[PDB]
Structure formats: structure tokens, C-alpha cells
């Protein structure tokens, strides 16, 4: 068949967040809250592309929009947050619920320096309705035209035709 | 022909609701009443069949067919009716079933418009006749003799119901009315050659062909005399009435392969009639007797002329009448003497005469005395088969000298000659013995006034 078509080098180096997995979790909600919009038209565009090709360019929206968060956690709350996520770190499930004071001061100074509120229990489940401008995706399986249906079946029901024609009977 | 598939439907309770004395008489009299009433087929014309419905029609071959068969019902009626006197009512009753059922199998068989319904009824025949055959018989050797009659009968027609399927498929009828204007042309092929085979085998094997006749001789001597007189006299002819119908199907493919075909019934003829030379048992003489006269009817067909078509109808209905004549009357010794040997009871114009009368005129249409329509079809057979080959002359007529070395020997060991002086039983000609002899031979003698009614669809 045909030659599959795979985007150059260049078109996927972006300035990944390099950060580790209980830095991410430890910041997870006020990401899930304040990152929502560029994450969501990536989400959107990728179950509705079903081709991760089709969406390179909302995905470098949202390495962009994940590091200008954890920039701005960087600029007021560095040290907080630093301590959150090692406590976090230290556990191997990673439980929230181990440590809670170190939550607490981050939420607080988090709330007081930026503004942000930590999603409650339930929001970040949501299904939100995203506004983009990118257009339907007609085909997205790539289909091709299905074939016509057999002729259904019409017209009135006569009586058959001299009975049943079964080599002598007569009905 | 629904007028006549009922009446003979509706014997069934006419001897299923009778008396436990009357039932012969009832039906008797019904059947005699039947085969008045089948004379209304006799409305048949130079061109056009009586063709009645979709499902029956009869021309001026199935009718002679018809009214013989019909006849013969009350004449089995009156033959049987001596040896099973002492017979149980229910089974009594069982017999008289399956000779009705058995007519009213042949008379639909004759009768049928379309092919598989032939074949179907020519293949029911088989069960009231070997149920016959293997109960009410009499010797040890009726078991093998329902054996031999069924198992090469299907080896014959199986194949057949293959073949008329063939031409449901191809044709897209049966119809013989129909078959008569869409009838293309058989041409020279494996295919076809073994398609007329399988058209024809099953009719050689009925009626029967030479070696496949190994059947008749055991199927005779061990049937009652009500199925030794429904098997020569109408069971033979299902043969050559199915060859006729079906030989319309088989040109010109007939003109090369029915060669040894012909050559089997035009010796078979010599042979049977060799082996009637030295019979030693009355019933297998007249067995094989009825293979040399079915053999003509074979070679009849099979060069399918109008003359040979003419003499095999009137040599069946004439062979018809006088083979069941001649079952009655070796029935009429073996009543009294209770063997069937041949040179047991010897010099009975002594003490039976009218008996010997009967003997005597059975034994001339035997050996085809004209004007007898014995003679009529034997000698229609012989010009059509002089056209045919200028030399099969010599085979009729070597086998007309030994027709007649074997029809007053049969005379002249059974009526002439000493007495046998050991046998005492020989009992008066009964009432019923020679109303049975005259009601087979009185036909056979007033169709030399009216022959034209026994020939065929194209007289
Ligand atoms: C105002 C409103 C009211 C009006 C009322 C009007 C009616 C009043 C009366 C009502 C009662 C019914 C009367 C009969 C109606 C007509 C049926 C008829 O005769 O069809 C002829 C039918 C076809 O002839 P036709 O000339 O083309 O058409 C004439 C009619 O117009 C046929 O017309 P059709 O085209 O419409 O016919 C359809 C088709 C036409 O037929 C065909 O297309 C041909 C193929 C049919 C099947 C053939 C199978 C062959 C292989 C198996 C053979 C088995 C053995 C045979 C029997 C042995 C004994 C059991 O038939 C069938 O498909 C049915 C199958 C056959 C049954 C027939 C009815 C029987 C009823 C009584 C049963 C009693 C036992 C009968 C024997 C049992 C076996 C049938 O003939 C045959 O098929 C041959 C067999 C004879 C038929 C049965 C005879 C019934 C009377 C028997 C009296 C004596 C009984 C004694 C005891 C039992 C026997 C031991
Ligand atoms: C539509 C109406 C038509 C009416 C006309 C009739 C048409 C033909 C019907 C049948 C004719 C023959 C019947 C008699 C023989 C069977 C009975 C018997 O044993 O008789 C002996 C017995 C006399 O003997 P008995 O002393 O009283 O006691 C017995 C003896 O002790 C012991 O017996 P036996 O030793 O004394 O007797 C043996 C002796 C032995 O003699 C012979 O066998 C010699 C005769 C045959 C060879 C020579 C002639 C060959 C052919 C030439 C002649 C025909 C063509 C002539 C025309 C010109 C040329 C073309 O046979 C005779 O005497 C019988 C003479 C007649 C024989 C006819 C030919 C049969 C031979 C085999 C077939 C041949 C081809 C077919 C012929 C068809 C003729 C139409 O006769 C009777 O008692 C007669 C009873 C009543 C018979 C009625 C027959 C007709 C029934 C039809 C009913 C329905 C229609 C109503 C008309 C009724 C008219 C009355
Ligand atoms: C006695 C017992 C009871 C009765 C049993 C049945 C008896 C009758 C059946 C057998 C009779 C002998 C065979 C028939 C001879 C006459 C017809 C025939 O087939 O001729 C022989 C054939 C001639 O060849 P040809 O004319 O070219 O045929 C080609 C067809 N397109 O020759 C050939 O093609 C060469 C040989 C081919 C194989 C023959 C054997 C198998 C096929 C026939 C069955």
C-alpha cells in the first residue's frame, strides 16, 4: 500500500516539562483547574482526530500552558511547594492523605500570592464543553463508501402461481 | 378418471363393513359393477386422447389396459376365494384390501398425465404385490421370490426417478401432453447413452428383458394365484406401457442403442421358449412362456414402428387374458392334486372334458390360432420386424414352431395320456373353476370380432 507519513524531527521537539511524576500529582488539581482550556481543545481534538498526527499543535499548547503554570507556582510559592511534593514523594502509592498540613500551607499560600482555588471533591470529573474553531472532523476512521443494500421487499402479496409447481400437485 | 379412483377407494369399506360371509360376494359384484363402468373410456379419437385433467388423461393405449385391469378384479376375486376358505376373516379381509389396492394402484398408474406420478404409483405397486407374494404364498421359497421381484425391480427404476428428475430440471415438465410438443432431439453422447439406460432398464427389468428375467419364474410359482394372475396379466404390461410414454424422449438415440437390447429379446425368445420344452413344473412353464411373449413386445417397442406399436398392444392385452387363463388353470390342478408337477396328473380329458375344453382353447391362444388377437398382435410384430431386418423372419418363425411344441405338450402331459392311477381326488369342474375359465376366455374371444379397440394410440 502507501507510504505512511510521519512528522520530521523538528516538528515534535517542544520544551518538555521536566519535572518528576509527584511534582505533577502533588500540583495536579490547581493544574486540572487553572490548565483546563488548552487541555481540554487537546483532549477534544484528540478523540476527535483519532490520530495523534492531527494534533501536534494542541499538544504543544498544552507543554506550553503546563510549564507557565509551574512557573508561576515558581515565582511565589517555590518553597511550599517544594516541601508539598517531597512529602508527597516520599510514599510509594504517593497518598494525598498522608500529607495534609503540607496541602494546607500550599492551598493557602497558593490562594493568598495567586488566586486559585483547589477543585473540590468531584469537579475535575466533569464534562465540559470546549469552544474551538477547528472544524468537525468529516471522516475520522477514513472510511470509504459502504455498498448499496440488497432491493427490499415490496408490492402486495399475490396468491403463487398454479399452486406450488412441485412436479404434479395442483395446490 | 375420478370416477373410477373412487369406486375403487370406496370398495375398501365395502369389504371392511360387510358380513363376515359376504364379503366375497359384495365385492364381486361392485368389482363387476367397476368394470362395466369402465367402458366409458372408450370415448377416444383419431387425433386428440381423452385427456380428463391435469393429473389424468387415457388414450387408446392406457384404455385396453384400463378395462383388462379392471376385469381383472373380480376374476382374482373368484380364483382366491378357494384356498383361503379356511382363511381368518381379518386376513381374508387384508387379502381383498390389497387387491384393491393394487388396482387402484395400476389404475392411476396407467392413467397418469405426468411422468413422477407414473413412476411413483409404478413404484407403488410394488408393496400390496409383495405383501401378496410373501404372505399368502405357499412354499418356502416365496421369501427369496419377494426378494428377487423387489431388489432387481429398483436396480431397474432408482436410476430411472434419476433420470425423469433430469428432465423436470431440463424439460421443466413431465407432462407427457406437454412432452409431445417440446420433445428435442437426443443426440450421441455418454450422457445421453446412459440416460436412455436409465429410461429404459427399469421397463426392461418389468417387463422382463432376457437375464433380467430371473425374477418371473420365482415370482409366479410362489405367488397365490391372485398374484400370478395380477403379475402376467397387468404387472408385466407397467414394462411396455412406460416404454412407450417414454420412448417419445429417446431419439434418435434409440436407432443405435437399443441394438442389444433387441438382441437379447430375439434370442430370450428362443431360449424361454426352449426352457418351456422341458419344465417339469405346470406355473414356471407358463412363467416362461410369459417371458417369450413379453420378449416380442421388447423388440416391439424398440424398433418403434406403428405396426410393431399395433402388435405389442394387442399382443399385451391378448397375452394378458390368456397367461391369467392359464394360471387358473393349473390353479384348477393344483386345487385337487396339491403339486404343481407337470407329469403328476396326467389324462384329465378323460375325467375333466369341459375342463379339457377350456385347456384346449387356452392353449390355442397360447400357440396364437387366428383369429385371436393373439395372432393379431404376434403377426403385427412379425411384418413390423420383417421391415425391420429381413432376417429376423427365421427368429419369429422358429420361435412360432416352438411356441406351439410347448402349448400342446403342456396339452398333451396335463389332458392326454393314461390316467395317473394313484390320484382319486379329482373332483367335478366346479361352477366357479369354469365361470372363471369362461369370463377369461369369452373376451379373448369376442376381441376377434372388434380388434380395433386393443390397438394403440395410432390405429
Ligand atoms: C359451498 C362451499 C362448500 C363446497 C363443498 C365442496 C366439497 C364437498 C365435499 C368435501 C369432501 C372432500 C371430497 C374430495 C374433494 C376432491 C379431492 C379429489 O378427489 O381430488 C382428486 C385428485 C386430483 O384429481 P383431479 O382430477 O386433478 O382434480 C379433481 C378435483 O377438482 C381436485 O381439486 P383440486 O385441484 O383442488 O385438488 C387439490 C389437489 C389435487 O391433486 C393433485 O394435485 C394430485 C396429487 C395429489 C396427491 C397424490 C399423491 C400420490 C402418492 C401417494 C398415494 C397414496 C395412495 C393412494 C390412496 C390409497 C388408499 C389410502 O389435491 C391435494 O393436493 C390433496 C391430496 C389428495 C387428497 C384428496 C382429498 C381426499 C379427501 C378424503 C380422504 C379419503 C382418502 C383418500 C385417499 C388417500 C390419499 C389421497 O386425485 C388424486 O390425487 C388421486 C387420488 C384420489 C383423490 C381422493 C379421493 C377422495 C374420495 C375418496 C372416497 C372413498 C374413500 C374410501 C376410504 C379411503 C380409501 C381407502
Ligand atoms: C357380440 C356377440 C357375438 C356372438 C358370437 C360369438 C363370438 C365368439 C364368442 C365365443 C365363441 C366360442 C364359445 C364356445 C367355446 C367355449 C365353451 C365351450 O367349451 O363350449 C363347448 C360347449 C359344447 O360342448 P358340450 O358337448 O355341450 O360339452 C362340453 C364338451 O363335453 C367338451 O367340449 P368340446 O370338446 O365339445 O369342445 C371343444 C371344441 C374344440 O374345437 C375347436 O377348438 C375348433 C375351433 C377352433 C379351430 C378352428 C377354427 C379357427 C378359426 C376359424 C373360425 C372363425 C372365423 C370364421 C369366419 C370366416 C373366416 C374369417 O370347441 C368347440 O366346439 C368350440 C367352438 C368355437 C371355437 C371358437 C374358436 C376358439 C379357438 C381359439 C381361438 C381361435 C381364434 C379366435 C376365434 C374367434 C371366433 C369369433 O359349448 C357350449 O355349451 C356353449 C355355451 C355357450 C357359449 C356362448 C359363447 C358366446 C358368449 C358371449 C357372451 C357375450 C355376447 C353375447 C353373445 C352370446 C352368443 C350365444
Ligand atoms: C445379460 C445380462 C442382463 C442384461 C444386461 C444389460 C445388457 C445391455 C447392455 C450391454 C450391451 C453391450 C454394450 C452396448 C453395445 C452397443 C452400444 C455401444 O455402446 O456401442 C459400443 C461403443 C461403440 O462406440 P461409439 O459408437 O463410438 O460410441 C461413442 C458414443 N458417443 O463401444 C465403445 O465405445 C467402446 C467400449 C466402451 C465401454 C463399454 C462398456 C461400458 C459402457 C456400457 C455399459
Request: aromatic share 14%.
Given at each position: 500500500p502507501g507510504i505512511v507519513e510521519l512528522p520530521s524531527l523538528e516538528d515534535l521537539k517542544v520544551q518538555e516539562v521536566k519535572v518528576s511524576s509527584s511534582v505533577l500529582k502533588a500540583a495536579a488539581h490547581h493544574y486540572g483547574a487553572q490548565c483546563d482550556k488548552p487541555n481540554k481543545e487537546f483532549m477534544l481534538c484528540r478523540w476527535e482526530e483519532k490520530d495523534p498526527r492531527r494534533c501536534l499543535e494542541e499538544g504543544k499548547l498544552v507543554n506550553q500552558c503546563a510549564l507557565e503554570?509551574?512557573?508561576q507556582i515558581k515565582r511565589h510559592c517555590a518553597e511550599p511547594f517544594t516541601e508539598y511534593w517531597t512529602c508527597i514523594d516520599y510514599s510509594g502509592l504517593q497518598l494525598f492523605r498522608r500529607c495534609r498540613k503540607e496541602q494546607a500551607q500550599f492551598?493557602?499560600?497558593?490562594?493568598?500570592?495567586?488566586?486559585?482555588?483547589?477543585?473540590?471533591?468531584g469537579e475535575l470529573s466533569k464534562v465540559?464543553?470546549?469552544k474551538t474553531d477547528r472544524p468537525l472532523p468529516e471522516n475520522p476512521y477514513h472510511s470509504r463508501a459502504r455498498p448499496e443494500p440488497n432491493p427490499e421487499v415490496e408490492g402486495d402479496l399475490k396468491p403463487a402461481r398454479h399452486g406450488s409447481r412441485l412436479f404434479f400437485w395442483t395446490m | 378418471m375420478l370416477k373410477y379412483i373412487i369406486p375403487t377407494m370406496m370398495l375398501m369399506p365395502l369389504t371392511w363393513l360387510s358380513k363376515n360371509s359376504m364379503i366375497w360376494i359384495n365385492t364381486t359384484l361392485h368389482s363387476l359393477l367397476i368394470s362395466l363402468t369402465s367402458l366409458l373410456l372408450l370415448n377416444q379419437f383419431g387425433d386428440n386422447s381423452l385427456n380428463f385433467s391435469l393429473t389424468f388423461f387415457s388414450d387408446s393405449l392406457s384404455t385396453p389396459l384400463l378395462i383388462l385391469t379392471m376385469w381383472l378384479l373380480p376374476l382374482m376375486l373368484m380364483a382366491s376365494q378357494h384356498h383361503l376358505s379356511?382363511?381368518?376373516?381379518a386376513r381374508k379381509k387384508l387379502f381383498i384390501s390389497m387387491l384393491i389396492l393394487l388396482q387402484?394402484?395400476?389404475?392411476?398408474?396407467?392413467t397418469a398425465t405426468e411422468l413422477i406420478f407414473f413412476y411413483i404409483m409404478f413404484e407403488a405397486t410394488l408393496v400390496p404385490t409383495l405383501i401378496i407374494i410373501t404372505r399368502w404364498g405357499n412354499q418356502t421359497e416365496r421369501l427369496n421370490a419377494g426378494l428377487y421381484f423387489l431388489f432387481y425391480t429398483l436396480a431397474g427404476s432408482l436410476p430411472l426417478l434419476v433420470a425423469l428428475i433430469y428432465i423436470q430440471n431440463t424439460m421443466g415438465s413431465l407432462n407427457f401432453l406437454i412432452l409431445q410438443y417440446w420433445v428435442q432431439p437426443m443426440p450421441n453422447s455418454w450422457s445421453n447413452t446412459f440416460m436412455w439406460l436409465a429410461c429404459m432398464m427399469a421397463f426392461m427389468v418389468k417387463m422382463p428383458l432376457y437375464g433380467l428375467h430371473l425374477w418371473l419364474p420365482k415370482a409366479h410359482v410362489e405367488a397365490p394365484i391372485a398374484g400370478s394372475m395380477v403379475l402376467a396379466a397387468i404387472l408385466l404390461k407397467l414394462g411396455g406401457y412406460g416404454m412407450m410414454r417414454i420412448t417419445l424422449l429417446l431419439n434418435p438415440i434409440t436407432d443405435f442403442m437399443a441394438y442389444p437390447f433387441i438382441m437379447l429379446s430375439?434370442?430370450?425368445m428362443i431360449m424361454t421358449s426352449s426352457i418351456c420344452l422341458r419344465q417339469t413344473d405346470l406355473k414356471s412353464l407358463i412363467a416362461y412362456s410369459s417371458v417369450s411373449h413379453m420378449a416380442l413386445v421388447i423388440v416391439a417397442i424398440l424398433i418403434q414402428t406403428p405396426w410393431s406399436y399395433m402388435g405389442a398392444t394387442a399382443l399385451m392385452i391378448a397375452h394378458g387374458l390368456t397367461s391369467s387363463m392359464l394360471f387358473c388353470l393349473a390353479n384348477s390342478n393344483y386345487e385337487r392334486?396339491?403339486?404343481?408337477?407337470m407329469i403328476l396328473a396326467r389324462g384329465l380329458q378323460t375325467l375333466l372334458p369341459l375342463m379339457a375344453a377350456w385347456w384346449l382353447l387356452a392353449s390355442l391362444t397360447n400357440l396364437a390360432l387366428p383369429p385371436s388377437i393373439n395372432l393379431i398382435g404376434e403377426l403385427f410384430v412379425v411384418m413390423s420386424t420383417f421391415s425391420w431386418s429381413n432376417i429376423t423372419i427365421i427368429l419369429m418363425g422358429l420361435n412360432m414352431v416352438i411356441t406351439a411344441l410347448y402349448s400342446l405338450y403342456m396339452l398333451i402331459t396335463?389332458?392326454?395320456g393314461k390316467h395317473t392311477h394313484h390320484i382319486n381326488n379329482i373332483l367335478p369342474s366346479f361352477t366357479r373353476e369354469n365361470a372363471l375359465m369362461s369370463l377369461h376366455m369369452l373376451p379373448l374371444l369376442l376381441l376377434s370380432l372388434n380388434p380395433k379397440i386393443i390397438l394403440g394410440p395410432l390405429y
Open positions: 503554570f509551574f512557573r492551598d493557602k499560600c497558593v490562594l493568598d500570592k495567586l488566586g486559585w482555588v483547589r477543585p473540590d471533591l465540559t464543553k470546549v | 379356511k382363511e381368518n376373516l387402484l394402484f395400476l389404475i392411476m398408474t396407467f430375439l434370442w430370450g392334486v396339491h403339486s404343481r408337477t396335463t389332458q392326454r
